Design a binder for this molecule. Structure first.
Ligand code: MG
Ligand code: MG
Ligand code: MG
Ligand code: MG
Ligand code: MG
Ligand code: MG
Lengths: 51, 113, 101, 269, 78, 467, 204
RNA sequence: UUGACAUAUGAACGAGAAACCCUAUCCUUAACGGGAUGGUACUGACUUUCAUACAGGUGCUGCAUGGCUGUCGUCAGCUC
């Protein structure tokens, strides 16, 4: 059970905040051009099913 | 005399990836100095992440070991042990053997002879 | 728990195998004595068969802790051969040197 | 002042920047200590202030300027290609990098020579008397002091002697007379010699357990046990191959216990 | 002793409590052994896709359940 | 059979590894920790627009029993040249307003990091504060003698004791209590007489020897209780009391004997570092005095004069001023003139020592140029390419313009979508002076780096040769 | 250069307040109690005000107690035989009065009252040394003899109605767990407890 | 079906409840799971549940790429 070890970067909130900022920036770049994830329960094939 | 030290003594075994003669200033003082034969472990891995089976790169992990003998007396054993617990040998893991003598109390087994 | 997504199922299996080790050993030891009564041997065989199959050590697969690769994982380094070669050519792996005998 | 009113005072003190709510704080807490009803609360306030973390956010500009002001630039490197040699050479120049017993007694005796330290000859003398006194005492003096102490304890138990200081004076006179009359490699003791073996592994990194730690071996010569031929043959049958006939040596190794001292006990048992 | 095989034949745990009551329905357990007490019962053995019907007789005792439900279709070349 | 990393062919000779340790039972833990720590330390404080950033050229890690040493190497910020009393909001919300035989053994781990553990430094600070404060008047004459020997005698300067102790509970019973608990917790036969050999450094008065032997013989044979007739002799059995206080007299020495608290100073010698804040500490100490005396005595003193007229326990006001000093020191946050770099280094050292169960030490060396390692040049090129300011040719020309003279050559390769007009990627190479990688006795350094762009990944490879 | 000194002086003045109240308070209260409160304040500032030298001394003491109090680095008295009988140790007090003449000769101690004060303060400072050694060494050790006696006791609890083969199985399981260093003692007694619990399910 | 896993935001319960865990036990599932019964310990800048930004993809493009590799080729060439 000790095979997969802890990663020491989780002790620093600055690195985690930087990674989360990168993820949120990529998410907003997707959302500005309307290529982000659809609403859960309202997928494209599900929207054509309700059409 | 060049004969073997067979009595009360501290033996030190030092294992490292590098030669301890490169930094011999950090070695503890000793009466005898001996070396074990080198031992290697061969690793052969594929160079490419995909199919290039005949292309290999070979690595090794070479083990080095030295043996140190410190002649001591029975009273100067804990005093030597205190400073031996705090040494810093450069890039190594050291190993303390203790050879000490006591005397056997035969009073609970003298009746059975 | 550990971070790599393709190592999650194996990590869960390793934790489950650590949880159920004592019961597995007890039931296997009960099933191993032939002088025991047959009813006790059958009930311990039943409890050995009711242990979760993900808690067995044979389901555990050694994966790379960096990438999650399931193949060519050296056990001493816990990394795949590609990670091993990449770290070894940079001098990052202690004691690892190019062999040219 | 209750805790709810004190919360407002503490809150108005923290995030305003002016030294205005402190008279209210000292007034409320002095009143709370005088009434001494919230005596269980001040301890957890002290714990909350001391142990709970605060907003320790260091900005990058302060980080860089505060790093730059404290470190002088190195002038002998010119590259980082031989940096581990630089660190190892810095460790070389430290004369007390590794301390042994000889350097320690050298600096101890030189501190003695400057009056800062005392010689320990009196201490090792009193330790020698505290450890081995029955070998440094003549045998007749042992029973003489025992008989005198028996006489003093016989006369003390009567009660009419008032022997709270007379017995001490009599013992002091007897000890003065005894001092006037008296003052004018292999192991110690006796028996067959045991030969122990022990190992300590000094692994780096704060995890000190190693599989080689617990094993203890004990050796003895069978001829030193005084056994007969039949007893020696029964011992050889019981032992088997742990006995070596060429060295006449019986070796008992114990590793089945978790700790070194348990294996040392198990060898002798 | 009288036993010629020291190890018992394997049976899954759901067949060890209700016994023949579990053998009038669909069975996914191809690794179990057909016991002598299972005779005169009808089982439907999963082959990967469908539950293949099998009738337990005297000659099926000591075999695995998966020996009577084939997993690959016997195939022909044009 | 393609071109390999230049580091690998000259790793045993002409270049050393950045780490220095050995283990066999713990190889996997340390080989994971090297990569994981070097990956963590390279992501610390990236360069913003206004900041030069934390740049690591080398990290040197050395592992010892219970101790690990980290040595950082940073380039200085290139810049062309010509408050704490009022801080708020840096302390927040204040809540809290309103099986004896079958014990568990010590847990062990082999491959990774330890779990979260509460610290011990508060108890150590308490034991070193309320005990062994060395303001007791026994030590004053000896430290005066030490100062006189320092400022007057040349023999107290070429000696090992001065060099060791000055690098340019009384402590005997504390050791006895510590060894008692440490030997009885592990069920070890604790003989306190044998412990006294640690107090002895051996490398007329025979009458006292004889009386001490007699007293030891008297106390040895006795202690056979359940008899009142001999208990009357036990009442006058204070003949060992005369042996107890026999060796007493005037003392003029501070014990720096007894090699256990000399080991504390030995560990202190390599752990002080290059930074201290005592000059700010004394200033804050003498200003918090006049802050405290101006705070009490503002016509609210009727509670304090009620306290002093209560009883002789006036000194429980010290707990009130404890809470006060804690409140003002919590309002500020971070010490007065404490170095922010060393505060962050201490914050890193705390969790590194808690996770590794060691005593880690981080020491920093500031170096002149960013051209002293291939890693620093690659990192600088990647940060110049992260925000678009210039082209590859201008980057190489700026690099070649300020090459120090140690560099006998350099080579930089760029890979990816180098031109925004075209879709096909290409590789552009720039070489300066000598970059022969097939000569093994040369000092060739190499480092790759990747650049995250809008159109994918750009890659920089840097070769540099030192003389 | 006027602005930085002006700002620092203004911040220092708004920090310390007006000095008249301090001089007014120092005269009302008295000089010797002022001295005691000053001693109390400087006793606070070695704890409340953090120092780099104090933290360095704390780290050095931490390293010394790490290396010294590690149970894997135990060596016994090198001239002594192992304690087979496993005698209980005598209390700390008695150990300290056992070594009284040596400590008096080594430490000074002019009279009996100095020794009594030293023993009293060492006794008051012993409870937190206990917690320090608990943090460093670990919980306990528990010798092999008591572990084996516990393992044998647990077996003897095999329910009385159970056949002789079950009792033989439990005794042999205790015997083979008796000589296994690769098992923790917690795992050993948990194994024996679960064996007895499984046996007791069918032999009430 | 906000998911096995992460972060953020907003509500709801909870000043010691619940989730969580176990030397756990029993029943029911082909199995994961599901349902009961005990015990220990924790929770207020904190736990859980819900909601939505989402999380997730060994899906496609090596003819968008980084990194790594094969080959011409240990051939004596290729350049400034
Ligand atoms: Mg080998
Ligand atoms: Mg992936
Ligand atoms: Mg497998
Ligand atoms: Mg898929
Ligand atoms: Mg291609
Ligand atoms: Mg190809």
């Amino acid at each position: 059970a000790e095979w997969y070890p802890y990663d020491i970067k989780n002790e620093d909130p600055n690195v985690l905040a930087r990674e989360e900022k990168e993820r949120l920036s990529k998410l907003e770049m997707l959302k500005r051009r309307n290529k982000g994830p659809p609403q859960k329960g309202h997928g494209r094939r599900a929207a054509k099913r309700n059409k | 005399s060049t004969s073997k030290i067979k009595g009360t003594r501290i033996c030190i075994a030092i294992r490292s990836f590098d030669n301890p003669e490169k930094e011999a200033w950090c070695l503890p003082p000793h009466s005898r100095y001996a070396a074990m034969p080198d031992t290697r472990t061969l690793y052969t891995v594929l160079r490419s992440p995909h199919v290039d089976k005949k292309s290999r790169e070979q690595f090794e992990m070479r083990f080095k070991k030295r043996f140190l003998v410190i002649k001591a007396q029975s009273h100067e054993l804990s005093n030597k042990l205190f400073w031996l617990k705090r040494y810093r040998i450069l890039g190594a893991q050291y190993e303390l053997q203790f050879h000490c003598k006591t005397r056997l109390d035969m009073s609970p087994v003298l009746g059975s002879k | 728990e550990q971070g790599v997504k393709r190592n999650s199922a194996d990590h869960r299996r390793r934790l489950l195998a650590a949880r159920f080790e004592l019961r597995r050993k007890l039931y296997k030891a009960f099933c191993k004595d032939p002088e025991l009564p047959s009813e006790m041997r059958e009930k311990n065989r039943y409890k050995l068969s009711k242990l979760p199959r993900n808690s067995a050590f044979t389901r555990i697969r050694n994966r790379c802790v960096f990438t999650g690769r399931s193949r060519s994982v050296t056990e001493l380094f816990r990394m795949s051969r590609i990670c091993f070669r990449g770290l070894a050519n940079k001098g990052e792996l202690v004691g690892i040197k190019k062999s040219s005998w | 002042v209750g805790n709810k009113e004190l919360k407002a005072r503490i809150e108005k003190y923290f995030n305003e920047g002016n030294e205005d709510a402190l008279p209210g704080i000292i007034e409320a807490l002095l009143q709370r200590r005088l009434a001494d009803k919230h005596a269980d609360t001040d301890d957890e306030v002290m714990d909350s202030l001391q142990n709970q973390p605060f907003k320790d956010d260091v900005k990058d500009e302060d980080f860089e300027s505060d790093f730059e002001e404290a470190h002088s630039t190195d002038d002998e490197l010119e590259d980082l290609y031989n940096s581990p040699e630089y660190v190892k050479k810095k460790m070389q120049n430290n004369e007390f990098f590794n301390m042994d017993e000889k350097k320690w007694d050298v600096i101890v005796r030189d501190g003695i020579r400057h009056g800062i330290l005392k010689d320990t000859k009196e201490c090792e003398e009193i330790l020698e008397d505290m450890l081995h006194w029955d070998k440094l005492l003549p045998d007749d003096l042992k029973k003489k002091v025992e008989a005198k102490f028996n006489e003093l304890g016989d006369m003390c138990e009567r009660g009419e002697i008032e022997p709270e200081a007379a017995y001490e004076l009599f013992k002091e006179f007897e000890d003065e007379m005894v001092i006037q009359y008296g003052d004018q490699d292999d192991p110690p003791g006796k028996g067959p010699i045991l030969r122990w073996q022990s190992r300590i592994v000094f692994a780096p990194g704060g995890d000190a357990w190693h599989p080689k730690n617990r094993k203890v071996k004990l050796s003895v010569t069978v001829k030193e046990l005084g056994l007969s031929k039949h007893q020696a043959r029964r011992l050889r049958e019981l032992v088997g191959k742990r006995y070596d006939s060429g060295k006449d040596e019986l070796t008992i190794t114990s590793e089945r216990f978790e700790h070194r001292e348990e294996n040392r006990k198990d060898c002798l048992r | 002793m009288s036993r010629s095989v020291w190890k018992d034949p394997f049976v899954d745990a759901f067949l060890m409590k209700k016994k023949n009551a579990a053998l009038n329905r669909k069975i996914w357990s191809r690794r179990s052994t057909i016991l002598p007490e299972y005779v005169d019962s009808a089982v439907r053995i999963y082959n990967g896709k469908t539950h293949v019907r099998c009738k337990i007789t005297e000659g099926k005792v000591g075999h695995k359940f998966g020996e009577f439900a084939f997993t690959r279709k016997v195939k022909k070349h044009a | 059979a393609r071109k390999g990393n230049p580091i690998s062919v000259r790793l045993g000779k002409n270049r050393s590894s950045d780490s220095s340790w050995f283990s066999d039972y713990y190889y996997g833990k340390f080989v994971y920790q090297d990569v994981n720590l070097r990956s963590y330390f390279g992501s610390i404080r990236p360069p913003t627009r206004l900041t030069f950033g934390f740049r690591l050229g080398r990290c040197i890690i050395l592992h010892f029993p219970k101790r690990t040493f980290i040595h950082f190497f940073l380039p200085r910020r290139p810049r062309r040249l010509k408050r704490w009393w009022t801080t708020f909001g840096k302390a927040g919300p204040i809540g809290c307003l309103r099986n004896e035989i079958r014990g568990w053994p010590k847990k062990k781990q082999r491959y990774g990091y330890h779990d979260r553990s509460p610290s011990i430094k508060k108890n150590l600070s308490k034991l070193l504060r309320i005990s062994g404060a060395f303001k007791h008047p026994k030590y004053a004459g000896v430290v005066n003698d030490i100062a006189f020997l320092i400022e007057n005698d040349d023999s107290f300067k070429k000696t090992k004791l001065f060099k060791f102790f000055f690098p340019k509970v009384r402590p005997s019973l504390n050791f006895l209590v510590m060894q008692y608990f440490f030997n009885t917790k592990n069920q070890m036969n604790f003989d306190p007489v044998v412990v006294l050999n640690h107090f002895v450094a051996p490398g007329r008065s025979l009458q006292k020897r004889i009386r001490s032997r007699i007293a030891f013989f008297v106390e040895s044979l006795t202690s056979e209780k359940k008899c009142l007739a001999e208990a009357k002799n036990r009442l006058t059995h204070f003949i060992r009391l005369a042996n107890d206080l026999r060796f007493a007299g005037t003392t003029k020495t501070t014990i720096s004997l007894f090699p256990f608290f000399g080991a504390t100073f030995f560990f202190l010698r390599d752990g002080v570092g290059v930074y201290n804040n005592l000059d700010a500490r004394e200033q804050l100490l003498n200003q918090l005095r006049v802050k405290c005396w101006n705070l009490l005595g503002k016509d609210k003193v009727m509670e304090l004069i009620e306290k002093f007229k209560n009883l002789g326990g006036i000194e429980e006001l010290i707990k009130v001023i404890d809470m006060m000093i804690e409140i003002i020191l919590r309002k500020r946050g971070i010490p007065y003139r404490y170095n922010s770099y060393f505060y962050e280094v201490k914050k890193m050292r705390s969790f590194l020592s808690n996770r590794t169960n060691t005593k880690t030490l981080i020491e920093s060396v500031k170096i002149k140029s960013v051209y002293q390692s291939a890693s620093l040049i690659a990192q600088d090129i990647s940060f110049q390419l992260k925000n678009k300011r210039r082209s590859f040719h201008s980057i190489f020309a700026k690099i070649v313009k300020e090459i120090p003279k140690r560099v006998e050559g350099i080579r930089i390769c760029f890979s990816g979508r180098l031109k925004d007009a075209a879709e096909k990627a290409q590789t552009k190479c720039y070489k300066h002076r000598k970059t022969s990688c097939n000569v093994f006795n040369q000092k060739i350094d190499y480092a790759p780096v990747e650049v995250s762009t809008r159109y994918g990944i750009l890659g920089v490879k840097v070769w540099i040769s030192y003389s | 250069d006027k602005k930085e000194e002006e700002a620092e002086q203004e911040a220092l003045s708004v920090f310390v307040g007006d000095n008249a109240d301090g001089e007014k308070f120092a005269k009302k209260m008295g000089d010797e109690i002022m001295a005691k409160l000053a001693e109390g304040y400087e006793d606070i500032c070695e704890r409340a005000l953090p120092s780099t030298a104090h933290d360095a001394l704390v780290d050095a003491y931490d390293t010394n107690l790490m290396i010294e109090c590690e149970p894997e680095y135990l060596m016994p008295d090198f001239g002594s035989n192992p304690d087979i009988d496993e005698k209980p140790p005598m209390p700390l007090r008695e150990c300290l009065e056992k070594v009284k003449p040596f400590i008096v000769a080594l430490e000074g101690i002019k009279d009996q009252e100095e020794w009594e004060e030293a023993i009293g303060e060492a006794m008051a400072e012993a409870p937190r040394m206990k917690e320090i050694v608990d943090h460093y060494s670990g919980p306990d050790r528990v010798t092999a003899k008591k572990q084996n006696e516990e393992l044998d006791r647990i077996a003897t609890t095999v329910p009385q109605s159970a056949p002789d083969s079950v009792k033989r199985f439990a005794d042999r399981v205790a015997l083979s767990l008796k000589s296994n260093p690769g098992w923790g003692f917690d795992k050993k007694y948990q194994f024996m407890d679960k064996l007895v619990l499984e046996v007791s399910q069918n032999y009430k």
